[PDB]
Curated annotation (Swiss-Prot):
Keywords: Acetylation, ATP-binding, Cell membrane, Chaperone, Cytoplasm, Host-virus interaction, Hydrolase, Membrane, Mitochondrion, Nucleotide-binding, Nucleus, Phosphoprotein, S-nitrosylation, Stress response, Ubl conjugation. Molecular chaperone that promotes the maturation, structural maintenance and proper regulation of specific target proteins involved for instance in cell cycle control and signal transduction. Undergoes a functional cycle that is linked to its ATPase activity which is essential for its chaperone activity. This cycle probably induces conformational changes in the client proteins, thereby causing their activation. Interacts dynamically with various co-chaperones that modulate its substrate recognition, ATPase cycle and chaperone function. (Microbial infection) Seems to interfere with N.meningitidis NadA-mediated invasion of human cells. Decreasing HSP90 levels increases adhesion and entry of E.coli expressing NadA into human Chang cells; increasing its levels leads to decreased adhesion and invasion. It comes from the Eukaryota. One of its GO terms (cellular component) is sperm plasma membrane. The keyword Transit peptide does not apply. The modification N6-acetyllysine is found at residues 43, 69. The lineage of its organism: Eukaryota, Metazoa, Chordata, Craniata, Vertebrata. GO terms for molecular function: ATP binding; ATP hydrolysis activity; ATP-dependent protein folding chaperone; CTP binding; dATP binding; disordered domain specific binding; DNA polymerase binding; enzyme-substrate adaptor activity. Its main location: nucleus. The chain holds residues 16 to 224 of 732 of the full protein. Homodimer. Identified in NR3C1/GCR steroid receptor-chaperone complexes formed at least by NR3C1, HSP90AA1 and a variety of proteins containing TPR repeats such as FKBP4, FKBP5, PPID, PPP5C or STIP1. Forms a complex containing HSP90AA1, TSC1 and TSC2; TSC1 is required to recruit TCS2 to the complex. The closed form interacts (via the middle domain and TPR repeat-binding motif) with co-chaperone TSC1 (via C-terminus). Interacts with TOM34. Interacts with TERT; the interaction, together with PTGES3, is required for correct assembly and stabilization of the TERT holoenzyme complex. (Microbial infection) Interacts with herpes simplex virus 1 protein US11; this interaction inhibits TBK1-induced interferon production. This is Heat shock protein HSP 90-alpha. The TPR repeat-binding motif mediates interaction with TPR repeat-containing proteins like the co-chaperone STUB1. Residues 1-209 are annotated as: Interaction with NR3C1.
């Protein structure tokens, strides 16, 4: 049971702009994804302060970065609050329509693609490096879903029967052939140190055999 959905026109436009604009500073995608993860983790931590049972789906609050050169994927896993199916369909928890309007106006006026996170649509910077993005997520109030999109104006949602996550969000970046630098340990470490120094959760970079 796979459901296919059209992006809102303004979100298809943002994705196209991201894909088609010449812009060399692509490494900011990782900062934006880690930032989203940090915000998701903040959310569950806040809930947990008045209801400890909120962490029954897992107490550890962290971010893992998992490169796989065989599959040409980079995976960003967090144990944050996760997303319900509704929030996944509603632009992965963002106010993407108004965010994209503001970002576009900022760009027309001299901002650049690196400032995307100030407009609350940083998720979509994944498409600077990924030909396809898969998002697996689990929220305490819903089941585990997989969202997926190779852009082109549509995404799919299905119940995920894969490995259960407990709680949180996993973003799997199926990288463009020319973007495999972001599987290399030294490159990922450099990006993290440069851009994510003040993220208040452990970020563990996995190594490959
Ligand atoms: O799970 C996520 C999430 C995590 C990481 C991403 O890259 C995108 C969404 N979110 C739900 C809580 O509100 C923030 C978004
Ligand atoms: Mg913020």
């Amino acid at each position: 049971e796979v459901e296919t959905f059209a992006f809102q026109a303004e979100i298809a436009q943002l994705m196209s702009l991201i894909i088609n604009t010449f812009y060399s500073n692509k490494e900011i995608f990782l900062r934006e994804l880690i930032s989203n993860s940090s915000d998701a983790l903040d959310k569950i931590r806040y809930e947990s302060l008045t209801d400890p049972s909120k962490l029954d789906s897992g107490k550890e609050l962290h971010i893992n970065l998992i490169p796989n050169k065989q599959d040409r994927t980079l995976t960003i896993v967090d144990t944050g609050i996760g997303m319900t199916k509704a929030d996944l369909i509603n632009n992965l928890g963002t106010i993407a329509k108004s965010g994209t309007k503001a970002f576009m106006e900022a760009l027309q006026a001299g901002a650049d693609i690196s400032m995307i996170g100030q407009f609350g649509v940083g998720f979509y910077s994944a498409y600077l490096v990924a030909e396809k993005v898969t998002v697996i997520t689990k929220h305490n109030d819903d089941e585990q879903y997989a969202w997926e999109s190779s852009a082109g104006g549509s995404f799919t949602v299905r119940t995920d029967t894969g490995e259960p996550m407990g709680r949180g969000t996993k973003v799997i970046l199926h990288l463009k052939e020319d973007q495999t630098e972001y599987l290399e340990e030294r490159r990922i470490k450099e990006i993290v140190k440069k851009h994510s120094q003040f993220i208040g959760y452990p970020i563990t970079l996995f190594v490959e055999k």
